[PDB]
Amino acid sequence: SPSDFLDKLMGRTSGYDARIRPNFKGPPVNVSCNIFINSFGSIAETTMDYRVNIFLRQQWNDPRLAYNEYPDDSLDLDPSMLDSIWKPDLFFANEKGAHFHEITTDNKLLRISRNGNVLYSIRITLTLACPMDLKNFPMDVQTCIMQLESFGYTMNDLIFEWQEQGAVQVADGLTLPQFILKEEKDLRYCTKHYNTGKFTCIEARFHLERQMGYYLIQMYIPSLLIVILSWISFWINMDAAPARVGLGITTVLTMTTQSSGSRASLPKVSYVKAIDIWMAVCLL
């Protein structure tokens, strides 16, 4: 039975119905899921989003995928047999755009254990949305979230929970520029009560700290330097009216163009930031 097993397991034989969830009219389907992030970058303040390539894995028991033929504990399968079995219909509540990867094959992984446990790993780009408070922009610490949520199954048919240990996994050399991803990642529930009932949700908190070294060069030093030469007009003679006035008249506009330059790198936010009350006071 080298290939009839795949037929008698699911598809063309044994009457496997991929439309009916496991253990129908029974307890819900606890889907233990964990995340592995490959890349974590492109964190734009203008768009309030970030792109994070991840491998989304998730296990769930399925009592009608238990086999007694091969003595193997687990059993790797071809991803083409991944469209003929049930799968939890989760999504990302703050998705804002997310696509699969079909580079040379569907980047999918299937593994049906001896008792029915179904591992399921897929790659996703998932340019999530990260509403970030910029009250202290140059030296702020944001928290970009990732909400894994069910859509078509209430919390009587499908329940999600993180891996008990090691749920979020970061690549080794993953170092995004201008930020540093803290090793602590908060895993909490985000259960969504919508108009149509109880819906499963589980999020992962990412704490990011802004590397101040860049803004220390482009923002603070030039405006700091522009304020310094405004002081050396007191050392020049006071009778030199046009020469003395030449300093301030160009430095006033100089700080004005500097303060404007601190905006294109940022969104158009209403309140005042940590750099605005630096550029404004230096303008003063």
Epitope: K25, G26, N156, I159, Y189, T191, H193, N195, K198
Partner: antibody, heavy 115, light 103 residues
């Protein structure tokens, strides 16, 4: 998350009373607020549910018309109004809130109503 | 859907073991909760989905059963276990409890 109700009530047969359920700990328009009845001599009994943001409700068939669910996001509170009180309305009315299911893991102190 | 605890009262003793039944009518799911109401206070959740525990419930509370029959079970009663125990089915629209059982 801590739900808070109003004090006891003393109403006459035929009047109508409005029991509130203050939501101290979360936005009232976030979770489904439920309403239960516990008449002494009998056990608890689910009245219905309301989502205080979408105006959606689900009344029990036995309590249709008797119970009127409302809400007010101005103070994070969900109201229930019992119309046409009788002698069979003397009980304790709770406002539970199940988050991860249809159970009731959060509760109010209990509004006693004697008609 | 009608739940039914066929014992309003049950005899027991401190430190002993007792099995409380709640024989539903239909085969809803394994969805059955268990509440504890001390006289004068709101009930509290103990076992949701008939086998899982709530954050804070002691270890001596265990749930079991499926289909129609269910059961709550204590192991070592302390001075805070003789109260009312309600079984709740949460696999339907009318969330009907049981008759309650005073321990």
């Amino acid at each position: 998350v801590q739900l808070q109700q109003s004090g006891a009530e003393l109403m006459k047969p035929g009047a109508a009373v409005k029991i509130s359920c203050k939501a101290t700990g979360h936005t009232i328009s976030r979770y489904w607020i439920d309403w239960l009845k516990q008449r002494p001599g009998h056990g608890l009994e689910w009245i219905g549910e309301i989502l205080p943001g979408s105006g959606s409700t689900n009344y029990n068939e036995k309590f249709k018309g008797k119970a009127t669910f409302t809400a007010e996001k101005s103070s994070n509170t969900a109201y229930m109004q019992l119309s046409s009180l009788t002698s069979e309305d003397s009980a304790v009315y709770y406002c539970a809130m199940g988050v991860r299911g249809n159970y009731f893991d959060y509760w109010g102190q209990g509004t006693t109503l004697t008609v | 859907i009608v739940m039914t605890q066929s014992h309003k009262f049950m005899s027991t003793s401190v430190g002993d073991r007792v099995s409380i039944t709640c024989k539903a009518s239909q085969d809803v799911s394994t969805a059955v909760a268990w509440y504890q109401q001390k006289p004068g206070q709101s009930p509290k959740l103990l076992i949701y989905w008939a086998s899982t525990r709530h954050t804070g419930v002691p270890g001596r509370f265990t749930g079991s059963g499926s289909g129609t029959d269910y059961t709550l079970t204590i192991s070592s009663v302390q001075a805070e276990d003789l109260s009312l125990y309600y079984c709740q089915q949460h696999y339907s629209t009318p969330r009907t409890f049981g008759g309650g059982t005073k321990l």
